[PDB]
Scaffold this active site. Sequence first.
Site, PDB file in Angstrom:
ATOM      1  N   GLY A  11     -34.140  22.510   5.528  1.00 25.19           N
ATOM      2  CA  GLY A  11     -34.579  21.212   5.023  1.00 25.19           C
ATOM      3  C   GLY A  11     -35.948  20.826   5.551  1.00 25.19           C
ATOM      4  O   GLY A  11     -36.479  21.446   6.474  1.00 25.19           O
ATOM      5  N   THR A  14     -38.706  14.284   7.981  1.00 25.20           N
ATOM      6  CA  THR A  14     -39.801  13.348   7.812  1.00 25.20           C
ATOM      7  C   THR A  14     -40.815  13.656   8.910  1.00 25.20           C
ATOM      8  O   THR A  14     -42.031  13.543   8.716  1.00 25.20           O
ATOM      9  CB  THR A  14     -39.310  11.892   7.968  1.00 25.20           C
ATOM     10  N   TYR A  15     -40.288  14.070  10.060  1.00 25.17           N
ATOM     11  CA  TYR A  15     -41.095  14.412  11.224  1.00 25.17           C
ATOM     12  C   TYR A  15     -41.555  15.858  11.173  1.00 25.17           C
ATOM     13  O   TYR A  15     -42.648  16.192  11.646  1.00 25.17           O
ATOM     14  CB  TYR A  15     -40.285  14.175  12.498  1.00 25.17           C
ATOM     15  N   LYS A  33     -35.400  21.406  14.849  1.00 30.57           N
ATOM     16  CA  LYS A  33     -36.411  20.575  14.177  1.00 30.57           C
ATOM     17  C   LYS A  33     -37.758  20.805  14.858  1.00 30.57           C
ATOM     18  O   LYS A  33     -37.890  20.607  16.053  1.00 30.57           O
ATOM     19  CB  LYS A  33     -36.039  19.083  14.209  1.00 30.57           C
ATOM     20  N   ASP A  78     -25.387  19.096   3.660  1.00 28.55           N
ATOM     21  CA  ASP A  78     -25.836  17.695   3.754  1.00 28.55           C
ATOM     22  C   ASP A  78     -25.269  16.926   2.537  1.00 28.55           C
ATOM     23  O   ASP A  78     -24.876  17.525   1.526  1.00 28.55           O
ATOM     24  CB  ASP A  78     -27.365  17.561   3.876  1.00 28.55           C
ATOM     25  N   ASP A 119     -33.698   5.101   9.239  1.00 29.00           N
ATOM     26  CA  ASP A 119     -34.071   5.913   8.093  1.00 29.00           C
ATOM     27  C   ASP A 119     -32.906   6.703   7.467  1.00 29.00           C
ATOM     28  O   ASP A 119     -33.012   7.908   7.161  1.00 29.00           O
ATOM     29  CB  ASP A 119     -35.309   6.769   8.393  1.00 29.00           C
ATOM     30  N   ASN A 124     -29.748  12.922   5.577  1.00 35.57           N
ATOM     31  CA  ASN A 124     -29.515  12.636   7.003  1.00 35.57           C
ATOM     32  C   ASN A 124     -28.039  12.428   7.282  1.00 35.57           C
ATOM     33  O   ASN A 124     -27.668  11.906   8.345  1.00 35.57           O
ATOM     34  CB  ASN A 124     -30.256  11.348   7.409  1.00 35.57           C
ATOM     35  N   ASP A 137     -30.463  13.081  12.740  1.00 37.81           N
ATOM     36  CA  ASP A 137     -31.889  12.860  12.917  1.00 37.81           C
ATOM     37  C   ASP A 137     -32.352  11.434  12.854  1.00 37.81           C
ATOM     38  O   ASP A 137     -33.045  11.054  11.919  1.00 37.81           O
ATOM     39  CB  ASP A 137     -32.636  13.688  11.880  1.00 37.81           C
TER      40      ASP A 137
HETATM   41  C1  LIG Z   1     -33.442  17.803   4.858  1.00 39.81           C
HETATM   42  C2  LIG Z   1     -32.231  18.283   4.337  1.00 39.81           C
HETATM   43  C3  LIG Z   1     -31.237  18.775   5.200  1.00 39.81           C
HETATM   44  C4  LIG Z   1     -31.460  18.781   6.583  1.00 39.81           C
HETATM   45  C5  LIG Z   1     -30.432  19.269   7.538  1.00 39.81           C
HETATM   46  C6  LIG Z   1     -29.387  20.110   6.955  1.00 39.81           C
HETATM   47  C7  LIG Z   1     -28.436  20.555   7.805  1.00 39.81           C
HETATM   48  N1  LIG Z   1     -27.382  21.327   7.445  1.00 39.81           N
HETATM   49  C8  LIG Z   1     -26.860  21.609   6.121  1.00 39.81           C
HETATM   50  C9  LIG Z   1     -27.516  22.799   5.476  1.00 39.81           C
HETATM   51  C10 LIG Z   1     -28.352  22.669   4.359  1.00 39.81           C
HETATM   52  C11 LIG Z   1     -28.904  23.807   3.775  1.00 39.81           C
HETATM   53  C12 LIG Z   1     -28.606  25.040   4.334  1.00 39.81           C
HETATM   54  N2  LIG Z   1     -27.825  25.202   5.421  1.00 39.81           N
HETATM   55  C13 LIG Z   1     -27.302  24.070   5.973  1.00 39.81           C
HETATM   56  N3  LIG Z   1     -28.532  20.224   9.176  1.00 39.81           N
HETATM   57  N4  LIG Z   1     -27.681  20.642  10.184  1.00 39.81           N
HETATM   58  C14 LIG Z   1     -28.170  20.065  11.282  1.00 39.81           C
HETATM   59  C15 LIG Z   1     -29.334  19.317  11.034  1.00 39.81           C
HETATM   60  C16 LIG Z   1     -30.122  18.606  12.108  1.00 39.81           C
HETATM   61  C17 LIG Z   1     -31.558  18.248  11.882  1.00 39.81           C
HETATM   62  C18 LIG Z   1     -30.508  17.159  11.961  1.00 39.81           C
HETATM   63  C19 LIG Z   1     -29.569  19.421   9.668  1.00 39.81           C
HETATM   64  N5  LIG Z   1     -30.539  18.945   8.831  1.00 39.81           N
HETATM   65  C20 LIG Z   1     -32.661  18.298   7.088  1.00 39.81           C
HETATM   66  C21 LIG Z   1     -33.661  17.830   6.231  1.00 39.81           C
END
Ligand SMILES: c1ccc(-c2cc(NCc3cccnc3)n3ncc(C4CC4)c3n2)cc1
Length: 276
Positions: A11, A14-15, A33, A78, A119, A124, A137
């Site tokens: 993903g 924002t940061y 991140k 997510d 946010d 998220n 996050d």
């Molecule tokens: C935008 C979208 C999703 C994220 C995002 C997505 C996931 N996991 C689900 C996922 C999604 C795709 C592939 N594999 C796993 N995660 N898991 C921990 C975070 C931690 C960072 C909090 C996170 N951030 C971050 C930004």
Amino acid sequence: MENFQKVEKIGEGTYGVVYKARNKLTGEVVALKKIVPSTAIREISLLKELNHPNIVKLLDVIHTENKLYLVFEFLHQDLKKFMDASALTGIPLPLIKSYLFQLLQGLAFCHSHRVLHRDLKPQNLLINTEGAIKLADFGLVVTLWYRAPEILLGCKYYSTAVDIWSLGCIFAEMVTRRALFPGDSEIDQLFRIFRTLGTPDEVVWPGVTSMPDYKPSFPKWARQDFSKVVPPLDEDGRSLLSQMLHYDPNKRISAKAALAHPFFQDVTKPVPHLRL
Ligand SMILES: c1ccc(-c2cc(NCc3cccnc3)n3ncc(C4CC4)c3n2)cc1
């Protein structure tokens, strides 16, 4: 990560960008991140203490060469991807209800420690195969869709009520399968809110006309019934939503109070069908 092996980009934060990664030692799978102000460091390091089952754990902070890496617990999907994947059929009400309840427990916890998310948005909110959902996050293009009106109107010292607003928007979105207020600019966002909930005035929100970005020239729109806003949500759900979307932040329901709403009388914990 000299200690981590990047697996894939999961993903775009924002940061910064988020990667799924493997702890080259423990073999632990985590989310990394990639994003420094001393204040930022103390603020973030503090979040390592904020642990709750409905909050994505911040495992570690790595500050090197002025680069900042945040190591989080990994979740398989997510809420945005899950919603898209559930577009044809929609997420079952019992699951929506369970997710809302869990997120309200997460916020109630954070808010009790005077920590705001600021946010919240579907990307998220992370879920697993056990039926849990977690807030990820915490703050400290970007979408304005979930931004509370007080922030849009220039309130500098907004409260925990902003998170309740965001979550109300997400709740409506899970139900109807369309974003509630998909603004594409700050003014479009505000007007979208006004067109649905009515243009705020001193009657419903004492002090609103004094706010920094409030203008007497805003068009005056009448409020719509929630029966039109979130069909086919039942009366208990429309009532709670209506409370989470109150204009006046001081009147907006708190996470703790929301947990007691009659909508949760029959809450359960279904398990989502996840295709990973
Ligand atoms: C935008 C979208 C999703 C994220 C995002 C997505 C996931 N996991 C689900 C996922 C999604 C795709 C592939 N594999 C796993 N995660 N898991 C921990 C975070 C931690 C960072 C909090 C996170 N951030 C971050 C930004």
